[PDB]
């Protein structure tokens, strides 16, 4: 009866019936799915006993079509998460194939733990393995319904947080050793320096240098456990975790601005490419793509043995915009730094006239 009510509800939605004693329906349908509807409609009218087959006329109007996405049991959770903010228009690039990986990845960097990564995915594999008998029961409160709707989202969240939990140890804030700890060079610091007088008294928590005999090899997979047992732990981590956060922030936003090209080269609108893709990828490489290569350059160049007076990336990012160059507090990071940086700002400066003034010529 609930089917028959639905068919009689959509026949109310059907033709004004003024034209003939027949029903006309302007339905939307996928173009590549068109053989299956015609094969069904040809035998659908056969059950009624009619010798007249119903026909399907294709229109060429200008009403806006709806969107449609091929939806699986897995990618439905990542689809409606994107669809909650805004429905996609006709033939825009769906970010949902990219949201499958990047959104559990961006969750895992800010929720990174091996121990909580175990807890998240073991709850997740319980939700998907027993999912037949859980779905058999009708309906429950909102702390089971949204959780069951995202059982595959929380699966990839628990898997990736195990991996990013290995990049920075942090298994219930504890750590593991996999053929490592090769920073903590005890002997060399004290053997090559003074051992016992220093053990108690003047120092209770004294620092290690890296250039006596101490640091050999940077822990082949993750953060070495010597930081977690130290007391200066955060000043290395907040130096690390702030740089990598803006490293991931650019190349994710660079990946977004490169997809604006494929939304303009498909519409055959070459006007939009010459002010939308070209100056935007120059504006982000000059200001922000230059920032991520300064993080890589400072990381490899300077070390513990030389260069205690190492420059800071906060001040040198300011001297790009506030054009004052020449100071003794912060040295240049590399030779010819004054010449390349003024060139990078003016080509970021003139992009704002180039984007603005040349597009309204329509």
Interacting positions 81-100 with another protein (CB under 8 A): 81-100
Binding footprint of another protein, residue count (CB under 8 A): 184
How far apart, in Å, are the Cα atoms of 276 and each of 95, 269, 346? 19, 11, 19
Least distance from another protein to the Cβ atom of residue 290, Å: 17
What is the rounded CA–CA span in Å between residue 59 and residue 112? 53
Residue choice 5, 326, 361, 362 for contact with another protein (CB under 8 A): 5
Largest CA distance in the chain: 107
257/333 with CB nearer another protein: 257
**Distance between CA atoms of 240 and 346, rounded to whole angstroms?**
30
Residue 258 to residue 98: CA distance in whole angstroms: 13
Asked whether position 163 contacts another protein by CB under 8 A, the answer is yes
- For another protein, the binding residues in 254-293 under the rule CB under 8 A are 255-257, 259-260, 262-263, 266, 280
Taking the CB of residue 209, how many other CB atoms lie within 10 A of it?
A: 15
What is the rounded CA–CA span in Å between residue 137 and residue 187? 63
- Shortest CA distance to 178 belongs to which of 215, 216, 214, 220? 220
Residues 55-74: x where in contact with another protein by CB under 8 A, - otherwise, as a string: xxxxx-x-xxxxxxxx-x--
Q: Which of residues 216-255 bind another protein (CB under 8 A)?
A: 217-224, 226-227, 229-245, 247-249, 251-253, 255
Rounded to the nearest whole angstrom, what is the least distance from the CB of residue 220 to another protein in the complex? 3
* Contact mark string toward another protein, 102..141, x via CB under 8 A: xxxxxx-xxxxx-xx--xx-----------------x--x
Task: Output DSSP code: residue 59.
Answer: P
Question: Quick one: 70 or 268, whose CB is closer to another protein?
Answer: 70
One residue of 35, 133, 200, 335 binding another protein per CB under 8 A: 200
Nearest distance from residue 197's CB to another protein, in Å?
13
Helix, strand, or coil (residue 251) = helix
Name the H helices within 263-330.
270-276, 278-284, 290-301, 313-321
State phi, psi for 18 to the nearest 5 degrees: -75, -25
128 contacts 176 by C-beta, under 8 angstroms: no
Could you say which residues in the range 330-349 bind another protein, by CB under 8 A?
A: none
In angstroms, give the least distance from the CB of 87 to another protein.
3
């Amino acid at each position: 009866v609930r089917k028959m009510k639905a068919i009689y509800h959509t026949l109310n939605l059907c033709n004004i019936d003024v034209t003939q004693k027949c029903l006309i329906a302007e339905v939307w349908c996928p173009v590549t799915d068109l053989d299956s509807i015609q094969f069904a409609l040809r035998r659908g009218t056969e059950h009624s006993g009619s010798t007249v087959p119903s026909i399907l006329n294709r229109m060429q109007t200008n009403q806006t079509p709806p969107t449609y996405n091929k939806t699986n049991k897995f990618t439905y959770g990542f689809q409606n998460i994107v669809d909650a903010y805004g429905i996609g228009t006709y033939r825009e690039i769906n970010p949902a194939p990219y949201t499958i990986i990047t959104f559990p990845f961006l969750f895992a960097v800010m929720f990174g733990d091996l121990g909580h990564g175990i807890l998240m995915t073991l709850f997740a594999v319980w939700m998907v393995l027993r999912e037949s008998r859980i779905l058999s029961q009708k309906n429950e409160n909102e702390m089971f319904s949204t959780i069951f709707s995202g059982r595959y989202i929380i699966l990839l969240m628990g898997v990736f947080s195990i991996y990013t939990g290995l990049i920075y140890n942090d298994c219930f804030s504890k750590s593991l050793n996999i053929f490592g700890s090769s920073w903590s060079v005890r002997p060399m610091f004290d053997i090559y320096n003074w051992t016992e007088e220093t053990l108690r008294g003047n120092p209770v928590l004294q620092l290690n240098p890296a250039v006596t005999g101490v640091f050999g090899g940077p822990y082949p997979f993750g953060i070495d456990p010597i930081w977690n047992i130290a007391t200066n732990k955060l000043t290395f981590l907040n130096s690390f975790k702030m740089k990598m956060s803006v490293i991931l922030g650019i190349i994710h936003m660079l990946f977004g601005v490169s997809l604006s090209l494929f939304n303009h080269t498909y519409f055959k609108k070459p006007l939009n490419i010459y002010f939308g893709f070209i100056p935007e990828i120059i504006f982000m490489t000059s200001l922000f793509g230059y920032l991520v290569i300064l993080i890589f350059y400072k990381w490899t160049a300077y070390n513990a043995k030389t260069s205690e007076k190492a420059p800071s990336l906060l001040i040198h990012f300011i001297n790009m915009f506030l054009f004052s160059y020449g100071d003794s507090g912060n040295s240049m990071l590399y030779s010819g730094q004054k010449g390349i940086q003024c060139f990078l700002v003016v080509v970021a400066l003139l992009c704002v006239p180039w984007m603005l003034l040349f597009k309204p010529l329509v």
